[PDB]
């Protein structure tokens, strides 16, 4: 990689510069170089990797939706399909980079529960993103790969984290949206969102100072979805 001759601490430093400049492609490239040094990320470094690649694929998905929509209005000429396919291929390239980093460097049996859940949930998210644009046999394997990563994350978080934990709630929220938008299982979507919300309320005594803010916003998103689906 072009980041191999750079110091770990300088790659982290320029990832922060890239963020302040809103240069997410560079932020991602720097954080990828950092991960390749082969040391465990701190919680803060983990968050920078995730922020950087969330912004890259986030922009590409939004661009895919605009084009995918303009294509469907031709209900023709090949231009819109072609351009949608170009953007699609770039999004698949970035998703493969992140899954490659997760499998190669970040997902392990060892390390705290928060890290093992956060990473398995990322794996679920990026397979979810590949599922949105995929077809046929590829699509089936990709949806099985998402559910499976999400499911592993859920087993770790039910065993090792309180029901109020923001990473556990965010895993449930995203898994529940997978069920709804991807796996065509409104029933599993509504059931997960409801048991997630209710279990946090029944164990509210566990809600920490450090999660009060993040867990309360995630609980509102769980509720808002239940209201949209019922």
């Amino acid at each position: 990689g072009a980041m191999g001759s750079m110091e770990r601490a300088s790659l982290i430093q320029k990832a922060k510069l890239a963020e302040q400049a809103e240069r997410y492609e560079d932020m991602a490239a720097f954080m990828k170089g950092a991960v390749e040094k082969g040391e465990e990320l701190s919680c803060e470094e983990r968050n920078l990797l995730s922020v950087a690649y969330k912004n890259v694929v986030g922009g590409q998905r939004a661009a895919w939706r605009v084009l995918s929509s303009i294509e469907q209005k031709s209900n023709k000429g090949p231009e819109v399909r072609e351009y949608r396919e170009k953007v699609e291929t770039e999004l698949q390239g970035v998703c493969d980079t992140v899954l490659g980093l997760l499998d190669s460097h970040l997902i392990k049996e060892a390390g705290d529960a928060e890290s093992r859940v956060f990473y398995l949930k990322m794996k679920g998210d990026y397979y979810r993103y590949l599922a949105e644009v995929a077809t046929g046999d590829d699509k089936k394997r990709i949806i099985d790969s998402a559910r499976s990563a999400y499911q592993e994350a859920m087993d770790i978080s039910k065993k090792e984290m309180p029901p109020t934990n923001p990473i556990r709630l965010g895993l449930a929220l995203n898994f529940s949206v997978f069920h709804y938008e991807i796996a065509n299982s409104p029933e599993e979507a509504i059931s997960l969102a409801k048991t997630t919300f209710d279990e946090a309320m029944a164990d509210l005594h566990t809600l920490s100072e450090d999660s009060y803010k993040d867990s309360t916003l995630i609980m509102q998103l769980l509720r808002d979805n239940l209201t949209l689906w019922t």
């Binding site: 919680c43 803060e44 983990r46 968050n47 920078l48 995730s50 922020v51 969330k54 986030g58 956060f118 949930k121 990322m122 998210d125 979810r128 923001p166 990473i167 965010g170 929220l173 995203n174 949206v177 997978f178 938008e181 993040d214 916003l217 995630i218 998103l221």
Partner: peptide, 10 residues
């Protein structure tokens, strides 16, 4: 900082 943004909520 960043955990909420980092969790890339759907």
């Amino acid at each position: 900082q960043g955990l909420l943004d980092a969790l890339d909520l759907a």
